[PDB]
Design a protein around this ligand. Sequence first.
Ligand code: HEC
Ligand code: HEC
Ligand code: HEC
Ligand code: HEC
Ligand code: HEC
Ligand code: HEC
Ligand code: HEC
Ligand code: HEC
Ligand code: HEC
Ligand code: HEC
Ligand code: HEC
Ligand code: HEC
Ligand code: HEC
Ligand code: HEC
Ligand SMILES: [Ca+2]
Ligand SMILES: [Ca+2]
Lengths: 75, 520, 71, 520
Amino acid sequence: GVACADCHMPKVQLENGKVYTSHSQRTPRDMMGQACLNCHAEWTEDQALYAIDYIKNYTHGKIVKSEYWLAKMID
Amino acid sequence: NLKPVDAMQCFDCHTQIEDMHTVGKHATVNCVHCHDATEHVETASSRRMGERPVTRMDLEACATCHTAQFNSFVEVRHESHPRLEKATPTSRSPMFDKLIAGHGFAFEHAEPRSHAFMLVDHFVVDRAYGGRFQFKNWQKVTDGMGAVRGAWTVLTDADPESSDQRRFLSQTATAANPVCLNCKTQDHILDWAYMGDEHEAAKWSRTSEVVEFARDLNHPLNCFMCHDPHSAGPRVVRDGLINAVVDRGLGTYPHDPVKSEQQGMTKVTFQRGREDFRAIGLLDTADSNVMCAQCHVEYNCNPGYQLSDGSRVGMDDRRANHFFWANVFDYKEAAQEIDFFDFRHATTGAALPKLQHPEAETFWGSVHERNGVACADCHMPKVQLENGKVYTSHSQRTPRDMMGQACLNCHAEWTEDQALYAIDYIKNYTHGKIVKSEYWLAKMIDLFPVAKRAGVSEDVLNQARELHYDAHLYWEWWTAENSVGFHNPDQARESLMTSISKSKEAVSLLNDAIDAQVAS
Amino acid sequence: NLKPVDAMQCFDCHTQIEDMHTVGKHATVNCVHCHDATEHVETASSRRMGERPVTRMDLEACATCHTAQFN
Amino acid sequence: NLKPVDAMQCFDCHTQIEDMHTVGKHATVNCVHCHDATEHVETASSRRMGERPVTRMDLEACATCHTAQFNSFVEVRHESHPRLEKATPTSRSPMFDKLIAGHGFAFEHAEPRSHAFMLVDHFVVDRAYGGRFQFKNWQKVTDGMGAVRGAWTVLTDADPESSDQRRFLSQTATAANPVCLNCKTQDHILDWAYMGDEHEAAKWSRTSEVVEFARDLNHPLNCFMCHDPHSAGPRVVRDGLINAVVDRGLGTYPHDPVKSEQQGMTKVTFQRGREDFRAIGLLDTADSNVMCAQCHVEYNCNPGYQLSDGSRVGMDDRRANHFFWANVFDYKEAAQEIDFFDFRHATTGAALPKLQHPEAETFWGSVHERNGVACADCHMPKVQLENGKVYTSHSQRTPRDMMGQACLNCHAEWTEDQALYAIDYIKNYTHGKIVKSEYWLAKMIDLFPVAKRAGVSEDVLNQARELHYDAHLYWEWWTAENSVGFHNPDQARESLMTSISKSKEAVSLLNDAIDAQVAS
Ligand code: HEC
Ligand code: HEC
Ligand code: HEC
Ligand code: HEC
Ligand code: HEC
Ligand code: HEC
Ligand code: HEC
Ligand code: HEC
Ligand code: HEC
Ligand code: HEC
Ligand code: HEC
Ligand code: HEC
Ligand code: HEC
Ligand code: HEC
Ligand SMILES: [Ca+2]
Ligand SMILES: [Ca+2]
């Protein structure tokens, strides 16, 4: 039941104030407290960032190998 | 969901509001945002109110369309230390207890904190309601948003079944009275006659039971204190200020008739039946100096005594709600004009004045004021954004937190460290002279018991008491004023040197008299 | 300074808009905030547009009441 | 390399140790880690010690298997300012010299610093040994690890050839006595009888030469003060605490019989021949409130006088080692029960009590204590690790350094800045009332010489001296206590207002009496 806004345009957190919805649609790296760690209480910011990077590093590896094999065929 | 009402129908009986609403930047804002008038409209005539319509005084009535201004206002500055007593060696007045003995401030006088807390802090300080009111627990002291929502959401009353002012703990006082509240809230703006005079249409007045009045009030610093809700234009609502500037003809800048004319005020009066009831002051310009002067002034808001014969002046007297609208060098004359003083010193017996936060009257004539600078320029500047719509910060706080926007934009010749160093030069020099003024006041005060016990004459003691009035005035102005000299450094210097001069004259007088009695 | 128009006059021909506007959280927001329709009202019929009204598409039309979301 | 001994052989004569060692989490830890008993075993019988075996009291005996707990304990908090005198305008008690005149604390009373230094700081403070002991040079003041290794590795004695207490510099005192050391070290745990009573098997007692005793002691806060070395289970070893809780039947929580029963203590006694000698108190739970109460309490550890007739109470009397185990409102009654006071004020002549660091007795009844919170939760929390084996921090320090683990885990509604602001509200308010209490005490004290010289009667002066006892008690409790109100803010408030009330009553009494003598 999670949606794009939960990670990319979360509610602002304020010590004292009227809450509103951030309209800065951007990577959760800039707002990890609101976009990630409120749900994932078991993690620190560095741990959550490490989990993102594990996926991105593995996927990019396979994109590069896919391109190597496509290029070999094309040639 | 709000449903709009027929404003044209309202205007068939409300021509005064029509002329303001239809012309300003709130012409498209429907009455339903701030009034529930359904039963009123069913029962009223042009000459009979019928059912009383409800008017919203909560700040959220504005925050719906003006969130940025609301959020910047309610922010709590945690570096503004809370509940910090001024009568301590590390704060503003190390010898305050000796010097103020006989006044209610001896029971407690803390430094200011953020605006969100003004109403709740008024209710809980030890000198105000005998300790009747407390926060619900010690955690609630952090809750600025809660305070704004309503004082009674965060506070408790020790005895809901009684309405008298009394002590609930031993070292408290009951200094609070209805006039105080006019600089904490304007929730009562439709239930209080101009100056708090008695009036058939007023629920509350100068002579009301302040505990009953307190329970009817909720919100701090209403947004409409500086902004008319109907025209959206700049104004003041504080009665005592309108009385000084307009009724007494002193002007917005008493020392500058030209500036007074260019940046003036127009008094607008509202009636109940055919009798005048309340008033506001529309400003010619969006002048923060006069907006902030609704509260950041020296005032009377309390009973006292007459200088002429020593008789009591009670809350029923118009002098119990008074803006002196005078600088430190004109104050004694201003107090003589209304034949008034605040208290008799517990040790010396002198009639003395009580001074409070005179920022507005101090700023007059300073280099910044003479160059057209105003409170807002240093304390609520425009926000600077790389990409965005500009608005005015409503977080009214020290410029130390925003030096780029509140200082260095004007002073391009300085780095932030240099500007801070210039501030500190003034504050350090001024504080040194406050501490020396207190040393000499204390030395004089301590001689009074010695002189009395030595048999010094009442004529000599009265001469010394006359010097004490001046020695006190020219010192306390500066512990009362919040800038530690920054708003007017040359004036602070001249005043504090005058205080020390007066104390020294009294010390010499008394020492000579004691020595003469010993010799005899 | 904006001056409000009579929405009821618009609603006579614009029932779909009436049904949406009167029910939601913009029921108090006047048409003048986003439309200039004076000549339109003078020339339209129930089925023909007449002179075309101006409609504001700029984001600042929302920014005066919703600055935080705009910024 | 250590070589294990036959524990079963030891147990043939040591059944008491067997029953503790074989059951707890030290069942596999061999005696050789802490005892050298080779000659003992060759010469002993079940009824004759033979050669005395050596027992290790150094903390490194535990650090070998428990490095993390040792290192967190010995860490020095450099932000805990060292050798900082409390009797100064910027510290805890700006008027302490006037108020404490007649007591040894006038010579020096610094703020606390890290636990590693407790024994060395006791030895070098100006009020303790007449300046006999110093660090070897001013560089050694930084060396926490060295202090833990042994006091005499970092200190020098001005005269190794004499053992009397005397002044080596003019503005020092000789307040130290053997009872003090029980809250600095337990190196003497096998050489001191319960309460320090005289005993044939005790090398040291209440009446020993404290300079000779000092030279036999080395380590601060031994690890076994809270942990039995044989069972590894939770305990206390401090005699005065066991006496209050068990012997006098007051319980671990005197204000809560149920909590006292659930979180109780069992006294275990060890004999020398057939005579009782020493004792410990095994705890039902690992209760840090009671562990920390071995030292963070108000106590007697000094000679004094009787309230009844003014006669001397010397170190030989059991009252020279006493835990009152009473809150501020029960203390006067507790002192009357043992017919005791500490000193006569140098100016007023009043019999007065001397109060010291009553954190444990202050915490009772506070909102945190009533909700089951304990000292450790705020001052030595569990460590939080992304990946690792959890242990308990032994760096017993302010929660300001670890707000995430010592505050915000419970208070999820707050940011760190908000929690700090709540602490500061309490401390600022409490400090203001301490400063005002001192102002009024000082005003009263200064009237005593005036009254005496005016010929005021002894009956009036004695009435004033009775008020001084209470005015002092209800003030000094809070300068002595280290939280500046945080541990119990409502109690501090009620107490300080009582002090001011008492001082004011005395000031009025004396002023009226002086005025009457002048009039006559
Ligand atoms: C949290 C569970 C997420 C959900 C829900 C959505 N997105 Fe996402 N997105 C997420 C991460 C961790 C990342 C990588 C960010 C990084 O800095 O490594 C992304 C990435 C994007 C991007 C690229 C952003 C950039 O590179 O700056 C886009 C444009 C994006 N995501 C879009 C998007 C949409 C449309 C979503 C709803 C269908 C959506 N995201 C959900 C995390 C999460
Ligand atoms: C889709 C890509 C959007 C664009 C374009 C705009 N907004 Fe938005 N808005 C969006 C979401 C997902 C939400 C939160 C809805 C929820 O309930 O979770 C919002 C919310 C608002 C609100 C309501 C108050 C608040 O929650 O902040 C307002 C007043 C609002 N949005 C205004 C606004 C403005 C002025 C925009 C142009 C700058 C804008 N929105 C664009 C999604 C989207
Ligand atoms: C003529 C039939 C009226 C109509 C239509 C409306 N109002 Fe009215 N109003 C009317 C009178 C005679 C009075 C009292 C004036 C006096 O002599 O005291 C009022 C008063 C108000 C008030 C102030 C109430 C108070 O607290 O003192 C308000 C806020 C107000 N009226 C609002 C209002 C609205 C919003 C209307 C249209 C929805 C409206 N009024 C119509 C007479 C008449
Ligand atoms: C939406 C329904 C609004 C409510 C509720 C409030 N205000 Fe307002 N305000 C609104 C608009 C559309 C505008 C004009 C914007 C523009 O720049 O064109 C305003 C303007 C103001 C101003 C500026 C006035 C000027 O410079 O002349 C102020 C000071 C102001 N509004 C204050 C204000 C107050 C105090 C409110 C609560 C009583 C309030 N507004 C409510 C929209 C809406
Ligand atoms: C407007 C002319 C005011 C009147 C009338 C009263 N107060 Fe006031 N108050 C005013 C200002 C501008 C400030 C901030 C600047 C400062 O020097 O404090 C305050 C502050 C307070 C405080 C908080 C600080 C403190 O002294 O502890 C309290 C508790 C307070 N004010 C109480 C109070 C009482 C009891 C009044 C009637 C006797 C009263 N205020 C009137 C402005 C004005
Ligand atoms: C006097 C002490 C004020 C209080 C109370 C409120 N505001 Fe204000 N506001 C004030 C000043 C000095 C200014 C700038 C005037 C200038 O042109 O220099 C403003 C401005 C606004 C505006 C206009 C847009 C902007 O400049 O930001 C709005 C919409 C506004 N203020 C709203 C507002 C709200 C919602 C308030 C209650 C939280 C509020 N104001 C109080 C001074 C004062
Ligand atoms: C009947 C005489 C009408 C009146 C009264 C109003 N409008 Fe209208 N409008 C009308 C028609 C027949 C049409 C064409 C579409 C249709 O529904 O058949 C329109 C169109 C518009 C539009 C769209 C313009 C575009 O560029 O496509 C707008 C924005 C609009 N109308 C606004 C509007 C307003 C604000 C009115 C009251 C001031 C109003 N209309 C009155 C017919 C009629
Ligand atoms: C002042 C004259 C407004 C204009 C211009 C715009 N909006 Fe608005 N909006 C306004 C109000 C008074 C409210 C109700 C606030 C409340 O909480 O009751 C709103 C509400 C919204 C919302 C929230 C809707 C919901 O949750 O159901 C949104 C998303 C919104 N407004 C968007 C929006 C857009 C996109 C605008 C430009 C076309 C716009 N608003 C202008 C006041 C005013
Ligand atoms: C019977 C022959 C014994 C053997 C075997 C062991 N111990 Fe012993 N021990 C014995 C006696 C009679 C006493 C004295 C009791 C008394 O009445 O005072 C002791 C004492 C100790 C002590 C305490 C010494 C002190 O400082 O007071 C210790 C620490 C101790 N013994 C240790 C110990 C160890 C480790 C043994 C096995 C290696 C051992 N003892 C054997 C009698 C006997
Ligand atoms: C190794 C030879 C050890 C020496 C020397 C000391 N301790 Fe120990 N301790 C050791 C072990 C293997 C264990 C059990 C670990 C486990 O969790 O299973 C312990 C345990 C403790 C405890 C915890 C006891 C409990 O929770 O019941 C404490 C408080 C403790 N140890 C303290 C302690 C002291 C004070 C020491 C010096 C006198 C000491 N230990 C030495 C291993 C070893
Ligand atoms: C346990 C009941 C104690 C007795 C017996 C003695 N002291 Fe103490 N001491 C104790 C604590 C809990 C603290 C820290 C808290 C605090 O308020 O300081 C101390 C501290 C000291 C210090 C350092 C601070 C200072 O006052 O300079 C010194 C020098 C000191 N203690 C000396 C001392 C003397 C001379 C004692 C016998 C007369 C004595 N202590 C006994 C706990 C206990
Ligand atoms: C080289 C030119 C040095 C400079 C630079 C600093 N110190 Fe020093 N210090 C130096 C020596 C050779 C000694 C004597 C060592 C010895 O064995 O006796 C010291 C001594 C000190 C002391 C002890 C003073 C005493 O016991 O009276 C202190 C507290 C000390 N030094 C501190 C210190 C500080 C803080 C310095 C930087 C501000 C500093 N020293 C510089 C050599 C040199
Ligand atoms: C009382 C003032 C203590 C002193 C002296 C020592 N420790 Fe401690 N220890 C103490 C507490 C309150 C606790 C936690 C109890 C609980 O369960 O909540 C502990 C715990 C230990 C343990 C157990 C493992 C752990 O929780 O970290 C060990 C092994 C331990 N302590 C060892 C130890 C050492 C080596 C000491 C001297 C440096 C030491 N303790 C002193 C309280 C007290
Ligand atoms: C878990 C073991 C907690 C620790 C750690 C801290 N607090 Fe606490 N606190 C806790 C509870 C359960 C309560 C009572 C809540 C209630 O509903 O009554 C409190 C209360 C406070 C208070 C109010 C005190 C009063 O009104 O007398 C304060 C000011 C407070 N807590 C602050 C606080 C601080 C600053 C802490 C870290 C230094 C801290 N608490 C830790 C539970 C726990
Ligand atoms: Ca005044
Ligand atoms: Ca004591």
